[PDB]
Design a protein around this ligand. Structure first.
Ligand SMILES: [Cl-]
Ligand SMILES: [Cl-]
Lengths: 435, 434
């Protein structure tokens, strides 16, 4: 009814049988070809993994168990008196395939509050990290050190049945998600508030609100933002580096602490976890140059000069998505309600009005619309979350929801060790010459 | 001449041109099909990545830049007064494609000695870890915290040219390899020697010997073992979880500290890093039961009972090769020279005599021959390295050589972000229907 674990236990068999049947008829069906270029190009365009939780729709954007972002915005429970969807309900959705009721979200909020405690060795470790150790490094180190709490690792060493892997993975995943905001806020306070305390978990608050309290914020609108943010960054298919890394590491039966810590090292990569920061750096320098009251014409000129010097507008352009990323639109709506007169937001809006028509006219980038990263920085910054190094940590806490939801399923469905075949250049040359 | 970095700078262009030409002609050539079964089966049999440092020959075993294990054993430099190949020379081989001279190995040994220092925050952190935090967790946490030393991370944030990525990756990789034995021995001592100190790096010793000194061992033959061990576990293609994880994380321009730390979380996985320990647990239970003077007949019976109850003999019966893993044979040779009368070794040998014949007769498993993991534990155990949790850390330090050698090449050749396409079950069902 409200126990997610029991609901999950009923869903799993039906899903194993469905996959069994599908593999009997279509197991040998060809879905793609592998070319030399694909091996050298980082498996680009190669369908290589099954990842259940989310799928990118070319017309609507990312879908969470079939539900578009606007549908999630509407149907997922909100906090009492709030308007943004709670991350709890997103997790329930990714895990079950079903929109949770109020009671179910409320139950999950209490679970994550109860399981929040950090062992003292992780507290000590975080408290002794120096201020030059990047926040993502601290996050991944702390999560790795949390694996001493892993009930999966202990049960595996005692010879537990394969049919039960998902249960321990579920437990550890729930513990980890509960603990993450505590780790993340400890890092924030140690780095940017001179080591002051995170205060206590409140057992009747939702996950985002306990998170904002521990960060030291007291602004209802910031909490609403954080709920929306944690919800919308939660998952984006299996192929991105953080999802794929958690999947790959998890396929060796490394526990969730270890899989999520590996994923964060992937997320810390500049080609994955920095786009928010890059947009914001660019916006800041833009506004310092041309001033807040820049005209449409002058901004349109600046954008033409940016393009004509062979540079891109950060946050604009997608290869498959045919409209504005609905994750951008969510943020835009939020900003129009709560900070419409913020000079930086007004620049972001002005660019939405101008950049796509300029990109359409240049005829170069296929879909000239913005993605989530074009909007997120100005919102964080407006509420005083100005430490750009830390933004990737927020992304990380959100992304836990999606990759741990799938990890439970990967173990429930018995996904094996991920082991593609490598070749050397020499080997591939021989291989193509025979034939 | 001896500066590996300059030699590497000359090799890189020739290799970029070679790959450019091969892609112009054969870029669109099909090398395989993807099936639904492959997506559900963890990409099994799908040629998915380019990894230059090592290749598995189905007739020979693993090859290091074309050289088989017995050839490496012969050609690679040894320590003064020693017989086992130094890991230094293996690294040089993987990095250059060439067997290093004496001078070159000697130069590399000095490099790794000079760069060995740990920052104090990593020392503090290791010194505060509790005894219930698994050694692989401590290893990965410490390496992640070492990323504050990363010159690649700083140069990238300053906008350095793509053509120079490999240089900084080389530097950080050399620093990491240097530091790893210090991290690993600090963990060993904190866990199993009551927090005693690791002592100092000696500038004139090779990497393995500084490593054994820091662990607290003073047995020449153990140092020889460690050299052989670190050499032979160094690389095994790109598709295993630790290599692939370093490759995937590295493709996002995460520095070597972060890539290697992720790889170790993968290695800590029971389906990847535990086979050594599993063989040894099984051997221990076997020898407790039947005693050290067991007959061939009685052992043959035990193995038949093991198989007939639907269980496997650990270390034997994998799908990879046609014949004995040459990495097993290396260890067997070692044991025959240095500990031929060890009761546990004598069991290992007795199993080599009997298990394959039984598996051949059962007709079930494709390869009835043993791999490296069937032999390594008894050797470690003989020299007093009895802490089985720690064995994966040794594997880790060895595996650094192979994955960091390739990481330098991946950045030299401009390999992009690894980004395959995922599908859901529902999505794949739609996809096959239209
Ligand atoms: Cl993503
Ligand atoms: Cl391996």
């Amino acid at each position: 009814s409200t126990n997610l674990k029991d609901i999950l236990a009923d869903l799993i068999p039906k899903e194993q049988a469905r996959i069994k049947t599908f593999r009997q008829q279509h197991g040998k069906t060809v879905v793609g070809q592998i070319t030399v270029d694909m091996m050298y190009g980082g498996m680009r365009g190669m369908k290589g993994l099954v990842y259940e939780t989310s799928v990118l729709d070319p017309d609507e954007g990312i879908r969470f168990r079939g539900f578009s972002i606007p549908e999630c915005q509407k149907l997922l429970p909100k906090a009492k008196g709030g308007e943004e969807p709670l991350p709890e309900g997103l997790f329930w959705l990714l895990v079950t395939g079903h929109i949770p009721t109020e009671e179910q979200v409320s139950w999950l909020s209490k679970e994550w509050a109860k399981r929040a405690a950090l062992p003292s060795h992780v507290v000590t470790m975080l408290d002794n990290f120096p201020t030059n150790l990047h926040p993502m490094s601290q996050l991944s180190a702390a999560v790795t050190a949390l694996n001493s709490e892993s009930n999966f690792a202990r049960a595996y060493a005692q010879g537990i049945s394969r049919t039960k892997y998902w249960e321990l993975i579920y437990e550890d995943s729930m513990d980890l998600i509960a603990k993450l905001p505590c780790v993340a806020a400890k890092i924030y306070r140690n780095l940017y508030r001179e080591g002051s305390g995170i205060g206590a978990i409140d057992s009747n608050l939702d996950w985002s609100h306990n998170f904002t309290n521990m960060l030291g914020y007291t602004d209802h609108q910031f909490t609403e933002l954080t709920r929306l943010y944690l919800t919308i960054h939660s998952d984006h298919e299996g192929g991105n580096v953080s999802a794929h890394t958690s999947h790959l590491v998890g396929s060796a039966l490394s526990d969730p602490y270890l899989s999520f810590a590996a994923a964060m090292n992937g997320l810390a990569g500049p080609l994955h976890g920095l786009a928010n920061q890059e947009v914001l750096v660019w916006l800041t320098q833009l506004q310092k140059e041309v001033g807040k009251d820049v005209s449409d014409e002058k901004l349109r000129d600046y954008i033409w000069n940016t393009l004509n010097s062979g540079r891109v507008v950060p946050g604009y352009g997608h290869a498959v998505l045919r409209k504005t990323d609905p994750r951008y639109t969510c943020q835009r709506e939020f900003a129009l309600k709560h900070l419409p007169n913020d000079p930086m937001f007004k620049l972001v809006a002005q660019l939405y009005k101008i950049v796509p028509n300029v990109l359409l006219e240049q005829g170069k980038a296929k879909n000239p619309w913005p993605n989530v990263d074009a909007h997120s920085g100005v919102l964080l910054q407006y509420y005083g979350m100005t430490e750009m190094n830390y933004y990737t940590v927020l992304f990380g806490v959100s992304r836990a929801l999606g990759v741990l939801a799938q990890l439970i399923w990967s173990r429930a469905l018995g996904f094996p060790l991920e082991r593609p075949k490598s070749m050397s250049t020499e080997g591939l040359m021989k291989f193509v010459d025979s034939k």
